[PDB]
Amino acid sequence: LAENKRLAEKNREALRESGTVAVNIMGAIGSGKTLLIERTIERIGNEVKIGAMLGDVVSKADYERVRRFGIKAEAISTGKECHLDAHMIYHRLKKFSDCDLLLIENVGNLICPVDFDLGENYRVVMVSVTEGDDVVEKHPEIFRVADLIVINKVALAEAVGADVEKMKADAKLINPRAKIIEMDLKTGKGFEEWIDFLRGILN
Amino acid sequence: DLLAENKRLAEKNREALRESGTVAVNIMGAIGSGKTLLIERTIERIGNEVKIGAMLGDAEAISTGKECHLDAHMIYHRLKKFSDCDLLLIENVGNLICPVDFDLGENYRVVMVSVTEGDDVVEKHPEIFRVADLIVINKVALAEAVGADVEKMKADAKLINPRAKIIEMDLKTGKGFEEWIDFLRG
Ligand SMILES: [Cl-]
């Protein structure tokens, strides 16, 4: 962790020098990190210069979709690690020095990323209701580090037997300071709130 | 899933171990929990009655490379060397988080925690303490001199992991070090 902390500080300073705001977006595979990133690019990509670093394996169609908006994007090679670390992006940040907002998609995992500072400005932790409504209480460590917690695909809550209000309450008990958004991209629920949070951090 | 390959090598590991009669122990705990010391004093005690192989994530050292945990693949390469061992003692990285997801193919899981890590270390790390078969609270004799509520640690562990066995241990006094043997023995 010592070498990570060192590179993490360098990533943070470099991000400060360029005025780029970086968001470490964590969550299990299927939590919907990629779609949220695309939808974001689609909504404010014209007003705001966005970079994307994708640390989950992304399909070809999704790579086309993100790159289609002329947005700078790239797969992060994570090799054998169950999480990103400051070293993985240390040499990549320069290519993104011209972005106002750098969206960093972490590995699909709710455990390993806890202890790794990437040098980011904000941490988001995404969870889908399809993961079970005890997923927050099962993973206190990761939910504690979040500045914003996204409970996702809520319009499927009933269908899957998941209790959204319990997920919200467990999140708040574990992390009293974090903003919490209940989100369903299909129905647009929570999206404006998400965008508003991004505008807040860029201004 | 992303652990698909780890699961594959874990089964393969779980086979080689069984067919060789070798029993493996995943030993987890913080960077100072005292895993190395327990292993030494384990070999010093019953290292004459049974053959003990040792792999250090922190007898041979395992290079974890860029990872924060051991994975089944690191074990798999070196398993042949220990096919003629009664007991295999695997010392995982000094880390209470990463090792949670990673089956190594082992028979038993132990998590060691020093009282010098705080009396809420247990409650802060439910995920790992939940996979333990045995939990070792170590250096207990320093609990008072450091202001750590040992009874709290236990309650937290029992809440999170009822079926797990718990031992209070201090090697400066060989406290609990004997029931640790009673455990291995079985
Ligand atoms: Cl790793």
Author numbering:
A (entry chain A): 11 to 213
B (entry chain B): 9 to 66, 83 to 210
From the paper:
After delivery of the Fe(CN)2CO complex to the large subunit precursor, nickel is transferred to the precursor with aid of protein HypA and HypB.
The only structure of HypB available was the MjHypB in complex with GTPγ-S. To better understand the structural mechanism of GTP-dependent dimerization, we have determined the crystal structure of HypB from A. fulgidus (AfHypB) in apo form to 2.3 Å. Each asymmetric unit contains 2 monomers of AfHypB. AfHypB belongs to the SIMIBI class of GTPase and adopts an α/β fold with a seven-stranded beta-sheet sandwiched by 11 α-helices. We have superimposed the structures of AfHypB and MjHypB, and found that there is a nearby Asp-194 on the G5 loop, away from the G4 motif, that can form a hydrogen bond to the N1 atom of the guanine nucleotide.
